[PDB]
Design a protein around this ligand. Sequence first.
Ligand SMILES: O=P(O)(O)O[C@H]1[C@H](O)[C@@H](OP(=O)(O)O)[C@H](OP(=O)(O)O)[C@@H](OP(=O)(O)O)[C@H]1O
Ligand SMILES: O=P(O)(O)O[C@H]1[C@H](O)[C@@H](OP(=O)(O)O)[C@H](OP(=O)(O)O)[C@@H](OP(=O)(O)O)[C@H]1O
Ligand SMILES: [Cl-]
Lengths: 315, 315
Amino acid sequence: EQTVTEPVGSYARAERPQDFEGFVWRLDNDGKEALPRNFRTSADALRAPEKKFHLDAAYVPSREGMDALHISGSSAFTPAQLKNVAAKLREKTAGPIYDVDLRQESHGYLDGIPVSWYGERDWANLGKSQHEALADERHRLHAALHKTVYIAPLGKHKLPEGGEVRRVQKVQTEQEVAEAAGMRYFRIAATDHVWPTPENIDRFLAFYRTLPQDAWLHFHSEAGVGRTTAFMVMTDMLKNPSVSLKDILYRQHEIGGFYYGEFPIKTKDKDSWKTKYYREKIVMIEQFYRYVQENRADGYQTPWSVWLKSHPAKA
Amino acid sequence: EQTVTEPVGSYARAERPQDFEGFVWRLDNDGKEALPRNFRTSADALRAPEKKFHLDAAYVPSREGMDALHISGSSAFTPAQLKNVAAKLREKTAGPIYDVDLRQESHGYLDGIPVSWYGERDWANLGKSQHEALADERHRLHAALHKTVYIAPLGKHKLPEGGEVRRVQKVQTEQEVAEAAGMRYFRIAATDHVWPTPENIDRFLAFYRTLPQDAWLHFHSEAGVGRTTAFMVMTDMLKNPSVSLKDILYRQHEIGGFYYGEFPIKTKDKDSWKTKYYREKIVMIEQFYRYVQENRADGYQTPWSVWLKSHPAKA
Ligand SMILES: O=P(O)(O)O[C@H]1[C@H](O)[C@@H](OP(=O)(O)O)[C@H](OP(=O)(O)O)[C@@H](OP(=O)(O)O)[C@H]1O
Ligand SMILES: O=P(O)(O)O[C@H]1[C@H](O)[C@@H](OP(=O)(O)O)[C@H](OP(=O)(O)O)[C@@H](OP(=O)(O)O)[C@H]1O
Ligand SMILES: [Cl-]
């Protein structure tokens, strides 16, 4: 027919939340290193591209605007690691430093240990509104206080392996941990592995509009790869609209992020469900760039969700 | 001074239940074999003793009373394995066959899979009365229905390793499963690793008293070793009081059970806590033998718990 059930950029809406409910408190960071994993800032030197993306290692992207961009990204962290990050970022700016938490999955800290309520594909909060996801999170964190919990790292086949059991004496939300490290906090509940929703992006752009000139944004997700890079890319496009799409994509990849341009996708058989979500992200990244280019001149009078509905992306 | 806080036979009462709360649905049997592990009956041939017990391999225990004993023991089982056990036992008797469940830990069947709510040392119900342990079990099993659960086998260090996640469509208690296999059901909530309590034994003795002559008792615990052998030994002593302690202990061991007499206890560093519980069971097995010998003449008018308080065991 002519009516589409889920438009491009919303494929995840077709999945059934009940088939991915949370079943374990996953260890988000073992706390052994001084900093979170995949830590990088926009002032960093560009490195050779990762071979899996089949890029031109000889291409030198423009760094126009990177010194003033003021953003960084990383994986999840322990409280001590976030204090190290905050201290490092303070050496680069006198503006407010934001911990921009991009995780939809319920997470927090049990006795200072960074944990998340993990469901298959990390989709324990799939389908929930940001309100419902945050309510789940608060309820779960609180329920763990003075209770025995099993906290484990995921091993072979994304299933618990080893870990530890403890009776919890202290519970904190990431907001509390960010404030204790001297950072401002802003939450965007984005689903792991997929393109952020129009709701997620409209929320980010509204937040972006409120920032003072010297604000520094430290984005993070679980690994500091998929969601973190998507938002770092969006920020680079918004702040440096005259830079080419290719340069934005190459430079965000070359300072240590994911590469959001076209590349030959290949997954292990067990990860084949990811293929179309990668393809969806490549197309949406181009569509967001188009949104920025067509709406920056009038100051974004119309939001991303609205413009995308009248300018749908195509596979 | 004079007053003793915990008498011999009750050491476990000094442990703190809050430090061993349940944290995972442990897989009790993977269902691969036709029968549960350590399956054996009193009609079986005696085999050579296990080396670790340092026994006399040349010794020939008396079998006096074994053919009429009518008892068996095994590990936990899937419903299909229990049906196989019941069919096997029916070839040996025309009397009622009892599934004597000796597990204090909460356990049952989720989608037919035998599971238990596991806490450190398998002590998730330590300290609870049987009434409280069964209420915990009934609430946990029921709460699992239509919910997502993580079921895993324990691997390295008694922590989950691998396993599976499933949204449960069927929940059953072992009572339901035993009845489906054509067995009567009798529960004694005995704590894993330790000597059965005076309450556990008083309950068993009262049940034993009213059994029809041709009743067949199939005992089981998790592995079919510690608790299963303790009750098989007690039944053998009760039913065959003229048989020597040495013969009872050797023969229950030689048909496939644990050896409940003195031996060179040698544990790994991580299992050193077990040492005193072994020593306690050796002493209590002797004390129970004394009880049977001294109370059989009047038909056991004095319960085990009462008699033990007036004749305490000595370390
Ligand atoms: O949290 P963000 O920073 O968004 O990054 C995600 C998480 O690290 C994912 O692991 P998890 O779901 O266990 O938290 C990982 O999936 P895998 O571990 O399956 O590789 C993703 O890579 P890909 O899904 O491969 O693209 C990566 O993009
Ligand atoms: O269930 P019953 O038949 O009473 O047997 C018990 C359980 O199998 C215990 O394992 P679990 O705690 O995992 O249920 C096992 O401890 P280990 O598995 O640590 O060896 C005991 O041996 P010992 O504790 O070694 O005596 C054994 O006697
Ligand atoms: Cl009781």
